[PDB]
Amino acid sequence: LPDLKIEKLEEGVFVHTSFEEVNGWGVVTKHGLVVLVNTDAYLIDTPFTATDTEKLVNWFVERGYEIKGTISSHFHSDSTGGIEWLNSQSIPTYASELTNELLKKSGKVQAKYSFSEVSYWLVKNKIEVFYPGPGHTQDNLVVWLPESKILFGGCFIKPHGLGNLGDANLEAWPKSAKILMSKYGKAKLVVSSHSEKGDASLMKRTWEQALKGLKE
Ligand SMILES: C[C@@H]1[C@H]([C@H](C(=O)O)[C@@H](C)O)N=C(C(=O)O)[C@H]1S[C@@H]1CN[C@H](C(=O)N(C)C)C1
Ligand SMILES: [Zn+2]
Ligand SMILES: [Zn+2]
């Protein structure tokens, strides 16, 4: 029931938070990002709903910013919910090829654009996209802001319990978390889908929870 929130983290980085009841887990709080590169604005994951997605886009346009693209970090609706409404607005939506396949196979609107990298610049020297391996899902990826050393980990960062296991890969998640820890050990801030922002140790905690959950 709470409203969409938009808070500023540092210059150029905003967390958007949206809320949705999902059967069993109760009310889910979902964090995403909005990254500004001069007057360009990029959505890192969409809010749950078209409504909130529209509200978030209007909030930044009305302040003089151009929405230039969006990328979903994985296929579940807490990252993809607003894709359809953005397509109907010719706002470019991005997802990996696997994520669009998983959106396909389960009957949901796909992002307009597919890519197949494991690491690349979404915006050169500004926003990096990285796939550490399967974890929370087979397609989950992260986004890295080298200039603020902030990392968006999505639903892969689980410092207090792994969450929905339905599409997760328990065997791989520890190794993926180790790879993530080595890549981004220099992070100063780690934003996740559902936990409070923290420092680089959230990645260690995630590895521990991935390990505990494999063991059962
Ligand atoms: C229902 C959510 C959502 C779902 C998912 O991606 O699996 C879907 C609605 O988008 N993402 C989710 C996830 O585990 O990452 C789920 S579970 C819920 C999220 N915050 C809670 C949590 O993280 N705990 C450690 C208890 C539980
Ligand atoms: Zn998910
Ligand atoms: Zn989630």
Numbering used by the authors: 4 to 219
From the article:
IMP-13, a member of subgroup 2, sharing 92.3% amino acid sequence similarity with IMP-2 and 82.5% with IMP-1, was first identified in the Gram-negative pathogen Pseudomonas aeruginosa from clinical samples in Italy and is a common cause of carbapenem resistance, often involved in large outbreaks. Imipenemases represent one of the major groups of class B1 metallo-β-lactamases found in Gram-negative pathogens, and these enzymes can hydrolyze all bicyclic β-lactam antibiotics. The overall protein architecture of the IMP-13 apo structure is consistent with that of the previously published metallo-β-lactamase fold, consisting of a global αβ/βα topology with a shallow active-site cleft at the border of the two β-sheets.
In complex with each of the hydrolyzed carbapenems, this loop forms a tightly locked, tunnel-like structure around the hydrolyzed antibiotic, with several hydrophobic interactions appearing to stabilize this state.
